[PDB]
Amino acid sequence: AKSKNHTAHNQSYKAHRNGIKKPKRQRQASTKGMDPKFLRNLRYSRKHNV
Amino acid sequence: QKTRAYSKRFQVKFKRRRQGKTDYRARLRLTNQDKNKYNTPKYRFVVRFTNKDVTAQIVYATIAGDIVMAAAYSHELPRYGLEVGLTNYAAAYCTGLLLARRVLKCRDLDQEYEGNVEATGEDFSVEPADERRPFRALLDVGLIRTTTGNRVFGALKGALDGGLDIPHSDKRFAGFKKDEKQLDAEIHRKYIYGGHVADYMKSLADEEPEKYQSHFSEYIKKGIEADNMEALYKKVHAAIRADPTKRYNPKKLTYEQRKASLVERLNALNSSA
Amino acid sequence: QLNPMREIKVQKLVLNISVGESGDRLTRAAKVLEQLSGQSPVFSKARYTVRSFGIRRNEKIACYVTIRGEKAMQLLESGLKVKEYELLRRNFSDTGCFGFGIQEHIDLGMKYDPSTGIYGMDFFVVLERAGYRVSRRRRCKARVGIHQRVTKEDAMKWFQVKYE
Amino acid sequence: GRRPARCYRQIKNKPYPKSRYCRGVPDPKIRIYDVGMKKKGVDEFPSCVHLVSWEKENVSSEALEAARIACNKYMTKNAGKDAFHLRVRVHPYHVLRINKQTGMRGAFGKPLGTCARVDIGQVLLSVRCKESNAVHADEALRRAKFKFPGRQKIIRSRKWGFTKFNRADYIKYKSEGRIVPDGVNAKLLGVHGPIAKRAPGQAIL
Amino acid sequence: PAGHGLRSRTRDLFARPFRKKGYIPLTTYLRTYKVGEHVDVKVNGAVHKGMPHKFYHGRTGRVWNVTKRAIGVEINKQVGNRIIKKRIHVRVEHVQPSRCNEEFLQRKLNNDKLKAEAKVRGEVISTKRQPAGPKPGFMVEGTTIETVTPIPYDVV
RNA sequence: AUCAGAGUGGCGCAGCGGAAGCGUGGUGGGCCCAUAACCCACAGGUCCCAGGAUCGAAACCUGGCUCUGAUACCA
RNA sequence: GGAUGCGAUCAUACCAGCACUAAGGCAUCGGAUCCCGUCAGAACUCCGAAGUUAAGCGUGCUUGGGCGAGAGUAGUACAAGGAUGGGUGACCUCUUGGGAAGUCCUCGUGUUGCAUUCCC
RNA sequence: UCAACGAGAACAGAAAUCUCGUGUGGAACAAAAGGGUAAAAGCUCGUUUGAUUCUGAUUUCCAGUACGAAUACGAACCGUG
RNA sequence: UAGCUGGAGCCCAUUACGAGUUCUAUCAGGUAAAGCCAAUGAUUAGAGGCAUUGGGGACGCAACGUCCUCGACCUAUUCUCAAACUUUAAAUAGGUAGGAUGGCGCGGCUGCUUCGGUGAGCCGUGCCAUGGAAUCGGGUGCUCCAAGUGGGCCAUUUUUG
Numbered sequence A: 001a002k003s004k005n006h007t008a009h010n011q012s013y014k015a016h017r018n019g020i021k022k023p024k025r026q027r028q029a030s031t032k033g034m035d036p037k038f039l040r041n042l043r044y045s046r047k048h049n050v
Numbered sequence B: 001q002k003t004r005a006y007s008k009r010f011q012v013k014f015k016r017r018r019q020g021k022t023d024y025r026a027r028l029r030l031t032n033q034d035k036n037k038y039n040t041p042k043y044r045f046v047v048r049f050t051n052k053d054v055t056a057q058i059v060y061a062t063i064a065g066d067i068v069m070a071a072a073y074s075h076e077l078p079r080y081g082l083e084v085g086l087t088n089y090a091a092a093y094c095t096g097l098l099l100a101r102r103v104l105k106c107r108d109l110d111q112e113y114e115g116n117v118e119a120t121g122e123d124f125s126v127e128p129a130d131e132r133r134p135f136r137a138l139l140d141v142g143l144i145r146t147t148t149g150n151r152v153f154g155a156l157k158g159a160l161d162g163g164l165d166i167p168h169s170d171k172r173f174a175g176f177k178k179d180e181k182q183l184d185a186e187i188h189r190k191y192i193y194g195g196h197v198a199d200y201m202k203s204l205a206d207e208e209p210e211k212y213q214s215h216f217s218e219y220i221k222k223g224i225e226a227d228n229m230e231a232l233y234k235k236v237h238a239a240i241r242a243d244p245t246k247r248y249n250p251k252k253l254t255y256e257q258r259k260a261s262l263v264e265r266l267n268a269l270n271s272s273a
Numbered sequence C: 001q002l003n004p005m006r007e008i009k010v011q012k013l014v015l016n017i018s019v020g021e022s023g024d025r026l027t028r029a030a031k032v033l034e035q036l037s038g039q040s041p042v043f044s045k046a047r048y049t050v051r052s053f054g055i056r057r058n059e060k061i062a063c064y065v066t067i068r069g070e071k072a073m074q075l076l077e078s079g080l081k082v083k084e085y086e087l088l089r090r091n092f093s094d095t096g097c098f099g100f101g102i103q104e105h106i107d108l109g110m111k112y113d114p115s116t117g118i119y120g121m122d123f124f125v126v127l128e129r130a131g132y133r134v135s136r137r138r139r140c141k142a143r144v145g146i147h148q149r150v151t152k153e154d155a156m157k158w159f160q161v162k163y164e
Numbered sequence D: 001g002r003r004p005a006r007c008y009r010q011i012k013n014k015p016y017p018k019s020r021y022c023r024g025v026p027d028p029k030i031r032i033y034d035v036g037m038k039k040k041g042v043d044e045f046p047s048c049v050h051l052v053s054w055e056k057e058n059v060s061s062e063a064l065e066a067a068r069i070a071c072n073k074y075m076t077k078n079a080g081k082d083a084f085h086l087r088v089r090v091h092p093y094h095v096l097r098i099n100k101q102t103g104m105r106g107a108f109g110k111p112l113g114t115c116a117r118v119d120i121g122q123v124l125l126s127v128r129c130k131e132s133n134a135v136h137a138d139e140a141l142r143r144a145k146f147k148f149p150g151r152q153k154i155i156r157s158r159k160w161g162f163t164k165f166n167r168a169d170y171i172k173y174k175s176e177g178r179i180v181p182d183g184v185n186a187k188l189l190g191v192h193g194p195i196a197k198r199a200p201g202q203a204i205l
Numbered sequence E: 001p002a003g004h005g006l007r008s009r010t011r012d013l014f015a016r017p018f019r020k021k022g023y024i025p026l027t028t029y030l031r032t033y034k035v036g037e038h039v040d041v042k043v044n045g046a047v048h049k050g051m052p053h054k055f056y057h058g059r060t061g062r063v064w065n066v067t068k069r070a071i072g073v074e075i076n077k078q079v080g081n082r083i084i085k086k087r088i089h090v091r092v093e094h095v096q097p098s099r100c101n102e103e104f105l106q107r108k109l110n111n112d113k114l115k116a117e118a119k120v121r122g123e124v125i126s127t128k129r130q131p132a133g134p135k136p137g138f139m140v141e142g143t144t145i146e147t148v149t150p151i152p153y154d155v156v
Numbered sequence F: 001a002u003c004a005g006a007g008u009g010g011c012g013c014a015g016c017g018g019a020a021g022c023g024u025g026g027u028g029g030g031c032c033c034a035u036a037a038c039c040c041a042c043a044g045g046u047c048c049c050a051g052g053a054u055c056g057a058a059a060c061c062u063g064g065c066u067c068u069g070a071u072a073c074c075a
Numbered sequence G: 001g002g003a004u005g006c007g008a009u010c011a012u013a014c015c016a017g018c019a020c021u022a023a024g025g026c027a028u029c030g031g032a033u034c035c036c037g038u039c040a041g042a043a044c045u046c047c048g049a050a051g052u053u054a055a056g057c058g059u060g061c062u063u064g065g066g067c068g069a070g071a072g073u074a075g076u077a078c079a080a081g082g083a084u085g086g087g088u089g090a091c092c093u094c095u096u097g098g099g100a101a102g103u104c105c106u107c108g109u110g111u112u113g114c115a116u117u118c119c120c
Numbered sequence H: 001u002c003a004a005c006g007a008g009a010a011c012a013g014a015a016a017u018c019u020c021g022u023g024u025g026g027a028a029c030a031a032a033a034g035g036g037u038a039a040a041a042g043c044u045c046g047u048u049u050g051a052u053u054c055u056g057a058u059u060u061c062c063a064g065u066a067c068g069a070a071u072a073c074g075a076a077c078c079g080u081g
Numbered sequence I: 001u002a003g004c005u006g007g008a009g010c011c012c013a014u015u016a017c018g019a020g021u022u023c024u025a026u027c028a029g030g031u032a033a034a035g036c037c038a039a040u041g042a043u044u045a046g047a048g049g050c051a052u053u054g055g056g057g058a059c060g061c062a063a064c065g066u067c068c069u070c071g072a073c074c075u076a077u078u079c080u081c082a083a084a085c086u087u088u089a090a091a092u093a094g095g096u097a098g099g100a101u102g103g104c105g106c107g108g109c110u111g112c113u114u115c116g117g118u119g120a121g122c123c124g125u126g127c128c129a130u131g132g133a134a135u136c137g138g139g140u141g142c143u144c145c146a147a148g149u150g151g152g153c154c155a156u157u158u159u160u161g
């Protein structure tokens, strides 16, 4: 009758049955959000390669 | 006299503060490099005055400890010609000139940054003009009060004339008109050429010849009358810009003799009375 | 040690007057100390607003000015001449100093050239041996050794064999 | 008015001692913890005997004062007020609560009384006496152990009264004068401290 | 929000260690961080700018961004049935270099010299640590032997 | 049992931090032969008990006490 | 064996009481015209060398406080896992592993970076 | 450099103002409680408006949405030293 | 709505990539214990000294003196404690690393960065890298569409009233 319910019961069991999904390790880890001062320069340097 | 709980809950400050020689609030803000430069230290122009010397050092910080790359003391100016009154405003000027010239010569750009060959009262900015920017150092006064006319800023003008690039403003050079908010070139000229001492040598020699003798003993016996400061500092400037280059304490007595004395004192007290 | 660096000498006379009031009362309490010192005094505001004393908080209730040097000696000798060169063998403080209190006009100076009344006042002198800057400077400040801290027995031994 | 003490026997809740948060606590029944001559030094009473509880409970303040009075009346009538020292070795610092139309809406309760949390083999009472008279004190402790909820032993101590000393070792220190009598307790002298602070005949390696 | 502020439940989490309060040693400001290095986030109570949330304390991650006064740390947070690469910025006061990889790097270079040396000599080698295995047999020279027995129960 | 309200001069009561009063009552004169009454003066209080903040408390918050007033219903 | 300057580690470095120091340096120290500062040249600022190691700085001592380490506390307290283990119950035992802390006792009281400079 | 303590100074006392000594924070930081701070993050003084503009990024709650709050850069313009 | 589940698959694959696991290494904690002979708080009982006078008897003709007194106070102690106390500090669990997504050499770019080829990063090229602890194994690895569920209960241990 107590309308408020909250348990962590069964929660690890549900979590671990599709595994703890680690996202795929990627070559060229993303540069989103890095220092734009550094990113501008890196983009210019890739612009002027030979 | 202090309780055990005090001693046990005490936290000792850094040793360079228990000795009271360093301001760590200033030191962190001086040596904290931007982390995206990754090694480039900020070199500090550290100028210090003792009661009879003027130390000047271009130093940078490293985990093992600060590392000096060029030192200049006012007590080595007797090598260059200035023998007396080596802790005045012009003496710190010449110390700064000497240190700047030595740094520039060591880093092999002195020929390309000569600054003013002749000292000028007007505040100086050097040009980074072409392909090789000037050496850049940060002034590190230390614990002293940064007031107008300070010998730290005399050394600052010395280094600026010597060719270093030092962040600066002309609001604390000697002769700053704190009312009009601008320097006087002539007044700073006078100060960097020891004029503020020369006028007072005349001030004592005019009608107070006893205090004059008892006050300027070394000047008198080295024969520098008041009108012979100008060219003296001219020639020291030239010389500096020409050549910028057993048991007496007791040992700790050891364990053996320590308890050798302890047994003796113990027998003395327990047997006695 | 009989070392010619260990001589007593005044550091400062402090001349305070606790008036606990304000207005023309304390303005004249100030100008009188001006006549004594030759230097402009500073007003000492109140704390704790103790009512039974009739003092509000943060109101100027005293006026003091610090005198040091030959002027201090010249005014201290008159201050002792008030007490006929004799103190109570208890005015001396354990650390370095002693004091006493007088009534103004037995000092030097015609009285009502300012039209200011008699103001009592607590002389308080601090003795020192040369070298307290090692406890008062900004860089490398530390305690002064016992051998060159003046204490009571030296204050008496300074007061009675000499200067009277 | 008070509840039966069986309702507060097990230790079931973390300590709730009187503090900046537990206010309204009543005063405890016991207000004195030493009875007899609490003034004699160590050497008058060498015999020490302990009433030791053997189980975790909450011996209430009333229970543990009833114990002191039940041992003390006996001990004073029989061995006189000249030959025993009583000390209860437990303190009522734990605070009990009570919850007395309304259901358990807001079921936290105002404090009821005070009780002391005992341990497995925690000395609960101790008395010290002279060996000739130790029988009275031992049997008095037995007359007191019917005042406590759990089960207790009555163990003669190997220590000298209320000291931290074995009998042979304490008397040996008394012989060599390496011990100071401070009163109810004792102090060794040791190899620490400055020579000057020691008595001439009291400096040891 | 929703019942807890950032610095909830951190009475003893964020406090300085005993007698280590006050000035911050300069090595924490001199240690330089390069993108890829492993840093352990442990918050400093005093420096209230740039603190991470209380979860990231006591964890390890690779740097991903190095800025003036601020390090971009990158650590894995397990929520639900997946791992989030949380990318946070912390000031240098709050992070230290990780020594998880010091022994790996040392063993890297040690292995490389050994494999070069084996390449020079008879070209077979096994550069691996085996876990503590069975010990070989050996003789023990009979010494004075101390006989020990169960002790009788003293109620004292 | 909860929830309010109020504890201030001898009594009943006013009070908004600098901070204490109102009637009456009491004390001393005056009028009267004398007592009122009337006229003129005088002295008041543990601001319920114990804390804190506050320039500044009796007021502000809280804990403890005593009285009063409410609400305690569908079975 | 020193010292100064900038420092790293921030008590083995501090704290208390004491005894002592060669040259050098630090310091104390003299003065207040100037820049500068305050009620006050005490502080700070400028200028300077008559003297003093008296103080600081440094070294050393104390059956010192503190701190650091070690033994010990102690395989004790606790605690992951097992029992159709004991017990009326509280609790406890055995099995497979982990394993603390005070008091007490012994020892110790800094290591060092760079630039300059002093010794006998 | 604080709170406090110690010795002191006319009226001045337990408490008014001043001086010296000790002072690991026993004070203060608008408020609740915790944390933190001592040549400061406290007290006094000078100068000020970064309590500004443009849009993103991240953390906290989170479904890894929003809001609030915070953090780190970027491009401007400035404050102070 | 996320989760848990099915269906459709697709992508690769025994090279690798992983793991509700252990080992080696290295971080972080403030719970059990423990502590008060350490801070905050609570607290029992004595011992010894001491006040520039907390107060009284007696001497104090007199004080810049004491003999008792309740006792402040100080000193070393001592019995017992703390979820909203803690110096210390477990066990259990927690994070990260254990290579082929590495390293070095050479010459190129940078509008960033430095006093500066000084760094930081990238680009082209050439070399090396015995597979870099144990054990086990194909994988949500990627995606889509969607069902039901969103009233729970019992037990051992920790645990609130």
Ligand SMILES: [Mg+2]
Pocket: A003, A004, A005
């Ligand atoms: Mg529900």
Ligand SMILES: [Mg+2]
Pocket: B026
């Ligand atoms: Mg500064």
Ligand SMILES: [Mg+2]
Pocket: E001, E002
């Ligand atoms: Mg919400």
Ligand SMILES: [Mg+2]
Pocket: E002, E003
């Ligand atoms: Mg929540």
Ligand SMILES: [Mg+2]
Pocket: E002
């Ligand atoms: Mg909500």
Ligand SMILES: [Mg+2]
Pocket: E012, E013, E015, I030
């Ligand atoms: Mg912690």
Ligand SMILES: [Mg+2]
Pocket: E011, E012
């Ligand atoms: Mg907690």
Ligand SMILES: [Mg+2]
Pocket: none
């Ligand atoms: Mg009448």
Ligand SMILES: [Mg+2]
Pocket: none
């Ligand atoms: Mg009448």
Ligand SMILES: [Mg+2]
Pocket: none
């Ligand atoms: Mg400041």
Ligand SMILES: [Mg+2]
Pocket: none
């Ligand atoms: Mg958001």
Ligand SMILES: [Mg+2]
Pocket: none
């Ligand atoms: Mg769904």
Ligand SMILES: [Mg+2]
Pocket: none
């Ligand atoms: Mg516990």
Ligand SMILES: [Mg+2]
Pocket: G101, G102, I034, I035, I088
């Ligand atoms: Mg402990």
Ligand SMILES: [Mg+2]
Pocket: I036
């Ligand atoms: Mg305690």
Ligand SMILES: [Mg+2]
Pocket: none
């Ligand atoms: Mg681990």
